[PDB]
Symmetry: C3
Subunit: 533 residues, 3 copies
């Protein structure tokens, strides 16, 4: 077997050059396809060219930053020193300019829009003040992250809701997701037949969850998700001054569920502080996961609003966490350790697809059973309350009626008008007591009723509300914060870090309340930027 030994020696001697040459050939082939497509027709091949250009730009950028980091830092150092020298007097100028800009924006846009937008701004202030007053350590508050998070939310809102470029970008992004969720029908039609639409939720909506989980697992294998997470976390870390671990988890929670996002920093969990743990749980509670987005879109909820709320929730979560539970210890973990995310044990892409599919079994099972139980309990509670109410000649008593009054002030402060605040309060109650699936289903009912065009009042009962109120409700309801998920959150986090069971239990309720407040802050900003139609 002399030839085999020669082949093995040749392979060993120049292993690095052989695989690099192969990869170069593949890249050259892809570029040849792109250039030929552009040559044959450019307008038809434009999106492929755009994708290739942006990918090349990002690759070159990352290589340069990795290679020339020291030189760039040294080059930037002098300006930082000069700014540090003049900051003692320049801080007042910068702060005054920012305050003046806020006042001008209010006077010349928010007042023009109407009273409800000003009420949204007031509600923003009031929620922040209530967070401060009931803070764990009111005297230890570091105010930089709070203002920076609120400012980042405002800037994202201006970019996406008040500019044609961002509005178009996110409408397009939402439309792509709607196209993407239709591919699951191919599998649903085989497994459950051409009559799979006879059972819409079970045989059409849950397969969307399965498919989305599969795709997310594939993307995690390929390493794209970690790349986006690192970028967003770096932005939040450099502006708000938050710790690397909580920034990474907050950025990750945009795409990943509360129970799986801490796995990004699993090794370092035992050494995190109390504040970072609170921030982790709050970020978990203030966001949703990319596996359940398609279901909410299938109900009829706006995709663009869901994506915008998911993006805006992270800085809100971090600001509210730092205000509610500020840092009184010294963090141990550093940036390099936090940013490295131990990938899963998948040898190839198809194994990642199978692992993503298998994990989705319990998710859909629990979703279905929880919905069954919650809706049966709702029916029983309404029947019991009607039974009790009839003893006072008020058989209309219901869970919805009580929630329409209990939660109305929260909706009013978010900028919802007087009439529609009572309807939004019912959705808040549904989310608080059962979950966000039920609330989004009811919101989809209201949206469909509005879209039909029927009467707005029948026998004195309002049937549907305005579109602005629907957007505000979409922002308010985007989260996994409910009283029933406290146990699963605590259990999973203890499983990852058994030593910290005592600390985890202490901060969980405060974290849930903070997540709710963060969703309401996102809703307040959306309300103050949207106009009355």
């Amino acid at each position: 077997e002399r030839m085999c030994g020669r082949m093995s020696d040749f392979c060993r001697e120049h292993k690095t050059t052989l695989r690099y040459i192969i990869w170069g050939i593949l890249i050259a082939g892809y570029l040849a396809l792109v250039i030929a497509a552009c040559v044959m027709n450019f307008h038809r091949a434009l999106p492929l060219f755009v994708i290739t250009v942006v990918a090349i730009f990002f690759v070159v950028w990352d290589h340069l930053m990795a290679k020339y980091e020291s030189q760039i830092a040294r080059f930037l150092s002098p300006g930082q020193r000069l700014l540090d020298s003049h900051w003692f007097w320049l801080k007042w100028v910068i702060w005054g300019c920012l305050i003046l800009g806020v006042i001008l924006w209010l006077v010349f846009d928010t007042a023009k829009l109407g009273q409800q937008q000003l009420v949204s701004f007031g509600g923003l202030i009031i929620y922040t003040s209530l967070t401060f007053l009931f803070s764990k350590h009111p005297t230890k508050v570091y105010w930089r992250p709070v203002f920076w998070g609120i400012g980042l939310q405002f800037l994202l809102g201006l970019l996406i809701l008040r500019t044609e470029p961002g509005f178009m970008a996110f409408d397009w992004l939402g439309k792509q997701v709607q196209t993407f969720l239709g591919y699951s029908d191919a599998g649903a039609s085989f497994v459950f037949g051409e009559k799979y639409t006879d059972h819409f939720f079970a045989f059409k909506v849950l397969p969307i969850v399965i498919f989305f989980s599969t795709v997310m697992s594939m993307l995690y294998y390929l390493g794209l998700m970690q790349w986006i997470i690192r970028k967003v976390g770096w932005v939040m870390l450099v502006t708000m001054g938050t710790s690397p671990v909580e920034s990474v988890v907050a950025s990750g929670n945009i795409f990943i569920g509360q129970t799986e996002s801490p796995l990004l920093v699993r090794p370092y969990l035992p050494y995190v502080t109390k504040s970072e743990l609170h921030a982790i749980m709050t970020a978990g509670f203030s966001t949703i996961a990319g596996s359940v987005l398609g279901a909410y879109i299938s109900f009829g909820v706006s995709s663009s609003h869901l994506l915008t709320a998911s993006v805006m929730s992270a800085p809100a979560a971090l600001a509210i966490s730092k205000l509610f539970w500020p840092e009184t210890e010294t963090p141990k973990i550093n940036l390099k350790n936090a940013m490295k995310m131990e990938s899963g044990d998948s040898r190839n892409l198809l194994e990642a697809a199978t692992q993503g599919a298998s994990s989705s079994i319990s998710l859909v099972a629990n979703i279905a059973v929880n919905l069954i139980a919650f809706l049966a309990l709702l029916s029983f509670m309404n029947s019991a309350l009607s039974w009790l109410g009839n003893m006072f000649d008020y058989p209309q008593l219901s869970f919805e009626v009580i929630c329409s009054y209990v939660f109305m002030p929260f909706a009013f402060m978010m900028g919802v008008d007087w009439q529609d605040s009572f309807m939004v309060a019912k959705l808040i109650g549904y989310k608080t007591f059962f979950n966000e699936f039920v609330a989004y289903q009811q919101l989809s009912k209201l949206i469909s009723l509005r879209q039909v065009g029927g009467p707005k009042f029948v026998d004195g009962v309002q049937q549907y509300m305005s579109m602005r109120s629907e957007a505000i409700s979409t922002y308010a309801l985007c989260g996994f914060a409910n009283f029933g998920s406290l146990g699963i959150v605590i259990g999973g986090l203890t499983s990852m870090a058994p030593s910290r069971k005592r600390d985890i239990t202490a901060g969980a309720m405060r974290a849930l309340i903070a997540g709710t407040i963060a969703c309401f802050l996102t809703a307040c900003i959306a309300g103050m930027l949207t106009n009355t139609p």
Copy 2:
């Protein structure tokens, strides 16, 4: 933050009074609602008043018993001493009076009813005698629990089946359950659509199981179930002289499944005797769980009979266990340890609801798969037996035909007439070899056929049987005793107590046989008290 420190000091100083005052205010509000409801209209508000009155009575009673236990015991002591002094001669008088009462009841009621009721009494005697003859320790039998359990069963039967108050109470109780199981349709209609009735069992019956498990978990969180269990267990403990642990488990098994009832005494399992372990498994085998009651009611089985059998099974289970495997050791566990039931790890009611829902996934999955497998095996076995029978010009050979002859004597001794005994034997076979779901389905078929009113015989084949036989079959079939559940019982009990694996395996088969005998004793009593229509 001086105000916050003042608030914290105020909260700490008078924590006990603050929460007590809050609870008092809530109670006052509830009482105000009740009294106002009665004032506006009394006949309409009667049930609420009754519920409030009984709750108040039980609260006051428990407080008094807890506070004045020593004084009451001291007050009762003299009479116990006097009775002990005169018992050597008074025991004969009491026993003779009881025997005379039994003879009179037989002569003046059972003989009047007919021959079948006397046969039911004879079958009671015969089953007890067979239990004694094949006993583990025939010379170590303590006869007090045996007679006390049979007497308690007879008294419950007289109260519920032979008095208007008890008959009405349990008919009302059964009717409430039927109303309760209808609430699951709200969730089933959403998850599975308005066509969920196209698949009746899977999309309408199993959701009932899910909902009932959820409600049972909520009740276990609230502590009501343990309260009822403690009351019933105390009655059985004080009359039959049984050990606290087995009394608690027997009372618990009325509501809870065999695999979960031992968790009530999980810490103390390693130290129980062989007899107590046998009693635990027997109680597990002689009863059903509150999660699967609604399914049997949905089939068409009488709710009142199911509840009555579930209540009557516990003293029967304990009597048969003590007769089959009497106690030859010294029990270690005491009343206080047995009565304390470590509650689950649920922080609030909604978490208990979610935990109850999640646990139901495996239950319904196993139910469905087991039914599929058992019914396919039944079809294959019947086809094979027809194939074999045709070789003797008897292609009618079947599992049902063989069981109609094998188990007929057991049904005859329970008081079923000659014609219907062969039909009841088939149900006994179904329960023995596959499970009680299959048997109750077949019984529901027979009940529906009777209710239609069609011919009782077609081509010489009896189509349905009498109502008394249906009741007797309902009592006989109420249990989880089948050859296939021995493994899961043993596995779970070893998991709770690994050290006792050797003892658990030894007594499991005897426990299964005892459970079957207990169900047959309940059926014998029901037969001797019911009349022929």
Copy 3:
């Protein structure tokens, strides 16, 4: 209790004779039934008589072999010594006779059949040569198992495909399975109603899997499966000279899945060599399980071909494993240890049925979810490729089109004609990238189209292929070898033997490739023996 003591003493004294007498009485009863059935009518009772005769023959045979093993070995020893003495010159004569027979068979049958059969033979040679060239240890090859496995495959093919007795036997065997899979409808119709056919796959096909798993568990309890396994493994061990452990696992994999077949030798796994581990994984990858056979038959795939391929796969798997990874160590485990198969923990048959049913839950769940995900991914990939292809005026680009060219040479070497090779390549791609369920579904589509009789070409697109190509595809696709099952195989095998994790990972990919090659060798033989219609 003197009588009970006397009974216990009587039972203890003559325990062996009592149970032997009882078993003898049962046997006498069975024989009486058989003889009476024959007396009443013989032609009607023939199959029962045949079954009884073969069972008696095998029982007597096994008893004699167990009792007289030493005498038979001593009696055979002289002839073995004489053959060993004359072998140095007799080996050339035997080898020349075999080569001459092969040449004659080719010339007088394969050439008569046509060119495609000769191409099948050439493909057999080419696959073997490629296996040798890329072997782990090309200089350490032991050639006896390779030739013996290929010869055993050829002999089985001649017996089953080219003789009336074997063809009839396996057609009958296939027809019995079709009858057997119909019994699951009884359970499916109850659990899912009379409309269970509205959802064919989920409510009719998976119940077949459940039922088959139940039956396999029952047979494993009874010990029949181990008996057949031992016979086949002994044949392969004595002819091919393979190690006992790998022979037992290869024979077991005919009936049992890859993830459960190693449990037959679980205790001895830590001490197996690298080659035996590779052979175990290869045997796992080259076969299917008896639980999923009914689903493929339900699609419309030939039962006889599936059974024949499953039988032929084992010697192919062992030959390809020994050629790809030959043995360079000393095996430790012996025949007695390998042949003993620790049975499961089931106390009775019905417990085995319940355990078989419960295990099937995860199997069907994973099957369904994996199919959903794979088919949605296929739709997305096809849409993306059409989007890319339209940039070159080729919107017909698809996964099927690419696979029709990538895998065509493999199909051509198996003897598929030029036109149908492109269609078989698509099935090979489906199996390689997703799994064998998808591939068999597509093959069933093609078979149904052929059976209808419509046009073979519409608008220049071939709709269906010949029957010989369908058989070749049936043989090629019979295996669990796909890139996504590597992880589950590795995980389970590490779980059974944690110490060997390093060795398991090394050989898994080579094992998967070997399994694919083994399926292709079975297909090559089938192609060279089948005729063109």
